[PDB]
Design a binder for this molecule. Structure first.
Ligand SMILES: O=c1[nH]c(=O)c2[nH]c(=O)[nH]c2[nH]1
Length: 512
């Protein structure tokens, strides 16, 4: 096919504009995923109580700090209890001499009158709106898990739709669906509907993710394909900083979710403008339109060959592939052929390690550091140079030497969080971010690597399987964090255990 791109211009204006346009959409799409750190942030909270919150209460010289000890028992974390209150005011507890036995456990009651939340950092969050705390606390990681399962099912549905209707035609409606479903999620009346809308949003997120990359590859000459895919990957790195900026600017979740969703109505329009994938139209029985798309791109690049491209030349120049790639085949065919079976096994373990380790740690930054906005931004700041170095190593050594080394180093950095002492907070945050950056370098490496390992028709299906495995690990992520009832030691050890072994296994994969 590349002989035709050589007539159309393999790296001209059109590829520049296409890369820019898709990079922007990928940035906003990344904000859509990372938003959970800010839309669903858990403000500190306590039970409503008369002496603290009754506006009709008789005034006294007692400070709020004293009334709080009079009204809320001490929690096991040595802070005011977040799920209990005193049945009757403990005036006796005002003195410092009071024993722990002064108030009986039977004097405590749950938040009968509801919770009160800290408004200082965020004006509103879903946790504050639907009381996803105490007995309901599990619902937040359930929301994240449902979002990731939505991505998984969307990856399952994208491939067939992409091949049946075209790359750009699926991408366009994925943009529209993201816009509409995010706008609706911003206004959901109750938690079940919010989860429903987030799920239907992730369903389209998956299609955008896959189609943008596939359509970048299918229009770019091979000599610069890795560079373009690296830029498409850096879209997410910049999306991290964009998320930090918007979350700093918009402290209300109902407004933040709307703001990060509206841009996709604009992305819709430019998705309409773009051309459908020429190779797809050529192989899928529509050269008559592939010629029109080709000469559209030629006009944009300014080539004279618009006078040369003709249907007979088009049919002649792709004879080999048109004569052989006539068969659609099921997903399980990736596992039926002996060679593709092993390629898929190793690539799937690599994708699983990426998705597991990254999405386990990237969505709970409130535990990793004292400033969630800055810590969110630092993920992009560290991911940029990691992915550029990944590109350089992938070019000057190869795909195989880069993948294994990146995963091993990221695994080591992840594990180090369990060996540095708890009190050295800054170093722990630094190492966590470094591990995330190494996993990002492995993400870029494998994205390029596994797109080469599979044939023309099934490339999209192979990448979809990669997405599904990575999001299986991602779904296990929040549940691995629900395992945190035994303390943070277990989740971090779990996250660190996988990537090192996945890297050691990666070395068996053939170079491409
Ligand atoms: O390197 C990545 N960083 C991300 O923040 C992100 N988000 C996502 O869905 N895929 C990726 N990949």
């Amino acid at each position: 096919f590349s002989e035709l791109l050589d007539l159309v211009g393999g790296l001209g204006r059109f590829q520049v504009l296409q890369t820019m346009a898709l990079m922007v959409s990928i940035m906003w799409l990344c904000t859509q995923s990372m938003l959970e750190n800010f839309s669903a942030a858990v403000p500190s909270h306590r039970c409503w109580a008369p002496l603290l919150d009754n506006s009709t209460a008789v005034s006294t010289s007692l400070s709020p700090e004293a009334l709080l000890a009079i009204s809320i028992p001490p929690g096991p974390n040595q802070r005011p209890h977040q799920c209990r209150r005193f049945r009757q005011p403990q005036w006796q507890l005002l003195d410092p001499n009071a024993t722990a036995t002064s108030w009986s456990e039977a004097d405590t009651e749950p938040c009968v009158d509801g919770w009160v939340y800290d408004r200082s950092i965020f004006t509103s969050t879903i946790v504050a709106k639907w009381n996803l705390v105490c007995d309901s606390h599990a619902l937040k990681p359930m929301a994240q898990s449902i979002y990731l399962a939505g991505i998984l099912v969307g990856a399952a549905a994208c491939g067939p739709a992409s091949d049946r209707f075209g790359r750009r035609l699926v991408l366009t409606w994925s943009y529209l669906q993201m816009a509409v479903m995010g706008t609706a999620a911003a206004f959901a009346p109750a938690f079940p509907v919010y989860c429903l809308f987030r799920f239907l949003l992730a369903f389209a997120v998956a299609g955008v993710m896959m189609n943008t990359g596939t359509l970048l590859m299918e229009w770019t000459a091979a000599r610069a394909r890795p560079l373009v895919m690296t830029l498409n990957s850096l879209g997410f790195s910049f999306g991290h900083g964009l998320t930090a900026a918007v979350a700093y600017g918009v402290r209300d979740w109902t407004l933040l979710q709307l703001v990060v969703s509206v841009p996709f109505f604009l992305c819709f329009l430019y998705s309409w403008w773009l051309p459908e994938s020429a190779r797809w139209l050529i192989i899928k029985g529509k050269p008559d339109q592939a010629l029109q798309e080709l000469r559209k791109v030629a006009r944009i690049n300014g080539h004279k060959e618009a006078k040369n491209l003709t249907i007979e030349v088009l049919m002649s120049s792709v004879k080999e592939e048109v004569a052989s790639a006539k068969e659609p085949r099921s997903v399980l065919d990736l596992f039926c052929v002996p060679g593709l079976r092993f390629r898929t096994c190793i690539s799937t373990l690599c994708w699983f390690a990426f998705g597991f380790t990254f999405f386990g740690l990237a969505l709970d930054l409130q535990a990793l550091g004292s400033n969630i906005f800055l810590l969110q931004m630092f993920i992009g700041v560290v991911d940029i140079p990691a992915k550029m170095g990944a590109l350089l190593l992938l070019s000057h050594l190869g795909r195989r030497p880069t993948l294994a080394a990146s995963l091993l180093l990221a695994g080591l950095c992840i594990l180090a969080n369990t060996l540095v002492p708890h009190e050295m907070g800054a170093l722990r945050s630094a190492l966590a971010v470094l591990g995330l950056g190494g996993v990002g370098a492995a993400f870029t490496c494998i994205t390029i690597y596994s797109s080469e390992l599979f044939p023309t028709v099934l490339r999209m299906t192979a990448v979809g399987l990669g997405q599904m495995a990575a999001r299986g690990g991602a779904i296990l992520g929040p549940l691995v964090r629900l395992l945190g009832v035994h303390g943070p030691w277990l989740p971090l050890l779990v996250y660190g255990t996988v990537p090192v072994l996945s890297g050691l296994a990666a070395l068996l994969l053939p170079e491409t």
